[PDB]
Amino acid sequence: TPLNPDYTFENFVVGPGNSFAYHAALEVAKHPGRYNPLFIYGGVGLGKTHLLQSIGNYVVQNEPDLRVMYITSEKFLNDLVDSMKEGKLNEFREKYRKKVDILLIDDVQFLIGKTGVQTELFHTFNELHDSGKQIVICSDREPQKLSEFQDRLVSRFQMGLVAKLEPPDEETRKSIARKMLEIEHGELPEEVLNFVAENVDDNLRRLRGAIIKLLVYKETTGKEVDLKEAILLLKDFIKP
Ligand SMILES: Nc1ncnc2c1ncn2[C@@H]1O[C@H](COP(=O)(O)OP(=O)(O)O)[C@@H](O)[C@H]1O
Ligand SMILES: [Mg+2]
């Protein structure tokens, strides 16, 4: 269980664009099994991984007596492959079924075309579902918009909670920016953060990136960071 400490509900700032997703996740984490499965989806850097692992962490702290599994569709891929090569499907099925109560799968757009894996995932799904094991899937695209995907799988995705994340507004971004800071224990002029929060509006991966970037600079350059400085430093985040 190598979940990321930062990815918790506590470090997740809520807002109009990610509230429902947030609650679905929290609700499911409080009642693993009551809503199987949860399918969160949204563009890049919008909270998918973070939300998904929070469910993980939250359950680890309240249900320590549970086998929580976080994985990547890709790893699910690479894991099967070896299973086929090394010739050990059992080792695999025991690992992704037998020994898991809750299974969290990130970025499932990696299985597009991979109908081989798609099929295996399909049953893994069904077996966990027939035993009340919570399933959570994250995708950068909605069930219906997943190209080259077995309808039977896609049908497994919609048969439960299906939340959507959308980019946050300036106000919410700023609060996220502030929360990102704490996590990194950094600090910034209540005018630089504002500038960053307002112009690094793609995804939250980059927003934090900038916030890290400066901090790394405020590191070397023993002195602070004035507005003008940050603007040159953050040139690949405003018009990348
Ligand atoms: N609602 C939020 N509140 C605070 N931080 C957030 C929020 N959403 C995303 N983040 C930050 O962005 C990062 C996660 O981006 P991520 O969820 O992995 O993008 P994606 O979902 O496309 O994989 C985390 O490190 C987290 O600090
Ligand atoms: Mg992700």
Side-chain angles (χ1 to χ4, degrees):
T1 316
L3 292 171
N4 181 1
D6 297 350
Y7 299 161
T8 65
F9 288 118
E10 298 91 70
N11 306 329
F12 198 91
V13 169
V14 183
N18 67 183
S19 172
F20 184 49
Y22 173 82
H23 291 285
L26 193 272
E27 187 63 318
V28 164
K30 287 189 173 177
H31 297 299
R34 169 167 301 169
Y35 310 111
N36 233 324
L38 169 50
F39 184 98
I40 303 181
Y41 81 95
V44 223
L46 300 192
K48 308 194 290 284
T49 302
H50 184 159
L51 229 26
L52 177 56
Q53 289 202 54
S54 301
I55 298 182
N57 277 308
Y58 182 79
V59 174
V60 175
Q61 190 180 294
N62 306 183
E63 303 256 45
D65 266 312
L66 278 197
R67 338 162 81 99
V68 183
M69 174 72 82
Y70 173 70
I71 225 80
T72 282
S73 286
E74 183 186 313
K75 180 165 194 72
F76 198 69
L77 178 301
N78 287 316
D79 258 41
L80 242 197
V81 166
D82 271 69
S83 155
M84 185 170 272
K85 187 202 205 68
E86 290 177 61
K88 217 319 95 281
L89 219 300
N90 287 300
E91 278 197 316
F92 185 91
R93 286 178 189 169
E94 293 291 290
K95 176 190 181 188
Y96 289 82
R97 313 183 191 193
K98 185 74 167 186
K99 337 192 74 181
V100 298
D101 316 314
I102 178 182
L103 182 260
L104 316 157
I105 320 162
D106 219 325
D107 296 282
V108 89
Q109 337 85 65
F110 187 74
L111 278 47
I112 298 172
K114 322 289 168 175
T115 50
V117 165
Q118 286 189 42
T119 289
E120 181 57 37
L121 212 200
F122 179 76
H123 296 304
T124 314
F125 182 100
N126 295 311
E127 197 174 78
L128 291 175
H129 203 331
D130 287 336
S131 25
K133 310 275 199 163
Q134 180 68 47
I135 311 276
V136 181
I137 296 84
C138 284
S139 169
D140 87 328
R141 220 74 218 301
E142 61 172 313
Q144 288 316 312
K145 239 65 173 63
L146 273 189
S147 94
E148 301 183 58
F149 247 76
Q150 291 168 40
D151 308 292
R152 48 174 189 169
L153 241 196
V154 187
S155 59
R156 304 261 95 60
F157 298 163
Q158 305 173 300
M159 77 163 95
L161 279 186
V162 180
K164 172 192 183 189
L165 287 165
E166 296 193 83
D169 57 11
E170 187 188 335
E171 170 168 350
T172 317
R173 214 177 325 162
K174 293 189 187 178
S175 307
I176 290 177
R178 303 195 190 92
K179 189 70 177 174
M180 254 153 36
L181 279 171
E182 299 169 47
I183 316 295
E184 302 294 31
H185 303 302
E187 161 228 300
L188 298 172
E190 42 283 302
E191 317 113 71
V192 173
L193 192 174
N194 236 62
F195 176 85
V196 179
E198 288 182 43
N199 308 293
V200 176
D201 48 16
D202 305 327
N203 49 288
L204 303 181
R205 196 212 308 306
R206 299 168 76 283
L207 187 243
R208 179 231 189 188
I211 305 312
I212 293 307
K213 179 92 179 316
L214 268 48
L215 296 197
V216 158
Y217 166 108
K218 247 188 65 182
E219 197 71 298
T220 288
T221 303
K223 88 158 198 63
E224 237 301 308
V225 172
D226 83 62
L227 181 56
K228 303 195 183 185
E229 311 175 25
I231 296 188
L232 162 68
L233 289 165
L234 304 182
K235 275 177 180 185
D236 301 299
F237 300 68
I238 297 159
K239 271 295 184 182

